[PDB]
Each structure stands twice: as structure tokens, then as C-alpha cells.
């Protein structure tokens, strides 16, 4: 897929992404906080359509993500992120997608997610998370 | 003066500011690096004119500031930053302004300046520096 | 189990821990780097014996951990860490223990493990990792 790297910011305000209950996660676009101002990052689109979108609007700054988890599996032979769950200190959003395959989880005891990077083709191939105090 | 706080970014690309050889430092506008992209921050203007401008264009990312120093003194009774000097790993820019009064210096052995905040009225009242790896 | 928290240091020099191919991970003792000096932290012992020990001596500072992974599962009804694998930039140590249950993985793209905390009773109940540049 096309690689992307939003880089680092000072927090997360909103996360919008696509998912297909039969396949996997699609595109995603994050709205970060940049020194108190909302900063809408680039839209990392899927190569295809047919997804259901989800828009997670966090009550920044009182609400923040404390865990990201999901499932990794193959779709048409490609190893991709098939499901995602975002747990905040206030509630849980998800799971969205197909909760089948190999699970992964990044619980955060202290610190904040301040950026995302990865790759998206037909589906979200993989992703990494920026962490900072 | 009017307080400002640019917040934090990932580096410095350019620093533009005013100075008057008879008074002190005036307004300033910093162009930061934000995850590889130039990010021009807000212009923090002086309440007056009559200054000489200086534009420091750093050869980002090979060139970076290793020390900020200057002088603090009174102008019309107000305690302000009267002079500034920016030393990088490649060269020294300054001093600019009036090198009289109380000196100050922030040499950086390891780390980077990633943001500025302060206050500007007729002149630069004071300022703080954001540091990060 | 008895909770422990080694806190943060400046790197990892050695990791010693117990494992039982039939049950799970036992006790562990980490030798950290503390500003260039080896610092042997407290020995977090298992409530029992019968384990096989493993001593991972890292070629500090050229060698460092780039991923910690393993399996979580039940032993006598308790949810514990049953297996661990430590991948460095030079080689892979493990898996050690029982690779059955729910997998977990913490790949590190940039940054360093500088501390461990957790709980150990008969087996390693759970653990967290300190990350820093």
C-alpha cells in the first residue's frame, strides 16, 4: 500500500476510519491536537470503496486513548489489520471490523498517543504509534 | 504586552525578528518544522514600527541552534529583551540589538529548541523556550 | 503475586528469568545500565521452584531489545505470562516457556526499554515496560 507518516503532535481529537465486517480496516484520517488547535492530518485512503465509516470524536483533553487493540489476519492473501478497538479513560469504541486472526494490544499505563504512521492499500496493511508524555 | 505561545513542534527552520540598535528587540515570527513540513507560526508583532528586521534561515535539518543568549534591560522603564544572539552548529547570528544590561545564556549540550512563547508589547518583554529530544 | 516496580534507568545490560515448559514464566531479575554503570535491580522471585533459568547478556550498548513478545494463558486458573521472546538488533532469545494462549507483542520502532514493573506469585502475573529515548 501507500505508506504514510503523520508524525507527532500534542494529542488526539478525532479518529475517522473505515471498516468492512467481511474484510478489514480501510482508510483513516486523524485530527490531532497541535498546541491547543485542531489539526486535521492527511486522509490516508483505501484503494477501494464499500466500507462503513466510524468517526470517534474524543472529548479532548479530558478524554484520551488508554489502549489500542485489534486483530491481524489475511484478506486476499495480504496480512492486514482486520479489526480495531480504541479504549479511552471514558469509554470503549469498537471492536470494528473482523475480530478474527492474531490479536494485538497496546495498553498505555502512562503516556499519550501523539501520532500514527503506517501503510494502506486495499486495507490498512500495518501501523505504528507515536508515544510521548 | 500581548502574550503568545507557539507551542511545540519538531524543529526550527527560520526565525524572523525585529531589533532597534537604540532600544530593544521587537516582534518575531518563527517558521518551525512540523514533521518534515515547514510550519509558519503566528506573527507576534510589536506595538510599534521603526525596527530593522533580520531573517535567520537555518539549513534544516543539518543546522540547528546550540545556544541562545542576549541582554535584558530597561527601555522606557520596561524590562525587556534588548539583544539576541543565535549560535548554531554552523555559525553565529548576532548579536542584534543593544548588548547592554544583564546577560543571559542558554547553551544546549544535547537537545533541541522546538518552540517559543513569551510576550511582546512595544518590545519583546520576555520569552521561554521549549526543549525536546 | 507480590508487585514490583524497578522504575526507570538508562538501558538494559542483562535479563535473567525462570521458565517452565509445562507451566509459565517464573521470577526475574534485571541488570540495568545506570549512566554507564551496571545496576543490578531487585530479584523478583517466584513463590516456588522447579524452573529452568535463562540469562540474557546483552552486548550493551551496541545491542538492545527491539521487540518483546510472548503468550498469556491460564495456569491453575491464574492468568499469567506463559512465554517470552526477546528480539534484539543482533539476535532473538526465545521463545522460552509455553507458547500457548493469547499472544502479545511490543515491537519498538524507535526508543528503548529502560525499566520493568509487574507482579510475580507462583508465576509472572503481568508486567509493564518503561520506554524512553
Amino acid at each position: 500500500g501507500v505508506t504514510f507518516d503523520d508524525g507527532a503532535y500534542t494529542g488526539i481529537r478525532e479518529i475517522n476510519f473505515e471498516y468492512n465486517s467481511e474484510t478489514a480496516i480501510g482508510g483513516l484520517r486523524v485530527t490531532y491536537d497541535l498546541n491547543g488547535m485542531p489539526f486535521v492530518a492527511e486522509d490516508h485512503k483505501s484503494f477501494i470503496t464499500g466500507f462503513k465509516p466510524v468517526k470517534i470524536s474524543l472529548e479532548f483533553p479530558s478524554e484520551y486513548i488508554v489502549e489500542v487493540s485489534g486483530y491481524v489476519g489475511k484478506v486476499e492473501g495480504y496480512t492486514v489489520i482486520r479489526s480495531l478497538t480504541f479504549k479511552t479513560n471514558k469509554q470503549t469504541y469498537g471492536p470494528y471490523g473482523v475480530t478474527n486472526g492474531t490479536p494485538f494490544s497496546l495498553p498505555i499505563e502512562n503516556g499519550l498517543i501523539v501520532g500514527f504512521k503506517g501503510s494502506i492499500g486495499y486495507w490498512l496493511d500495518y501501523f505504528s504509534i507515536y508515544l510521548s508524555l | 504586552g500581548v502574550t503568545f505561545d507557539d507551542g511545540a513542534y519538531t524543529g526550527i527552520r527560520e526565525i524572523n525578528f525585529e531589533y532597534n540598535s537604540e532600544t530593544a528587540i521587537g516582534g518575531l515570527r518563527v517558521t518551525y518544522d512540523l514533521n518534515g513540513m515547514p510550519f509558519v507560526a503566528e506573527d507576534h508583532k510589536s506595538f510599534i514600527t521603526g525596527f530593522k528586521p533580520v531573517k535567520i534561515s537555518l539549513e534544516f535539518p543539518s543546522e540547528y541552534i546550540v545556544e541562545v543568549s542576549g541582554y535584558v534591560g530597561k527601555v522606557e522603564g520596561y524590562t525587556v529583551i534588548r539583544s539576541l544572539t543565535f549560535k548554531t552548529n554552523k555559525q553565529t547570528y548576532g548579536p542584534y540589538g543593544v548588548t547592554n544590561g544583564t546577560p543571559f545564556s542558554l547553551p544546549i549540550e544535547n537537545g533541541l529548541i522546538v518552540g517559543f512563547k513569551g510576550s511582546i508589547g512595544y518590545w519583546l518583554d520576555y520569552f521561554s523556550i521549549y526543549l525536546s529530544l | 503475586g507480590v508487585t514490583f516496580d524497578d522504575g526507570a534507568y538508562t538501558g538494559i545490560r542483562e535479563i535473567n528469568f525462570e521458565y517452565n515448559s509445562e507451566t509459565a514464566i517464573g521470577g526475574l531479575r534485571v541488570t540495568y545500565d545506570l549512566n554507564g554503570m551496571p545496576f543490578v535491580a531487585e530479584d523478583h522471585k517466584s513463590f516456588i521452584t522447579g524452573f529452568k533459568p535463562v540469562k540474557i547478556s546483552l552486548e550493551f550498548p551496541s545491542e538492545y531489545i527491539v521487540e518483546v513478545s510472548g503468550y498469556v494463558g491460564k495456569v491453575e486458573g491464574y492468568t499469567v505470562i506463559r512465554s517470552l521472546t526477546f528480539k534484539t538488533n543482533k539476535q532473538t532469545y526465545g521463545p522460552y516457556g509455553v507458547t500457548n494462549g493469547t499472544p502479545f507483542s511490543l515491537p519498538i520502532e524507535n526508543g528503548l526499554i529502560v525499566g520493568f514493573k509487574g507482579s510475580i506469585g507462583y508465576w509472572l502475573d503481568y508486567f509493564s515496560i518503561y520506554l524512553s529515548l
Partner: peptide, 14 residues
């Protein structure tokens, strides 16, 4: 250099 560094964990999905 002049580029601020960040702690990055992952990737997940490989």
C-alpha cells in the same frame, strides 16, 4: 541533527 525524535511502537499488521 535538528529533527526532534519520537518514541514509536509497532508496527502491528506485518
Amino acid at each position: 541533527n535538528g529533527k526532534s525524535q519520537s518514541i514509536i511502537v509497532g508496527p502491528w499488521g506485518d
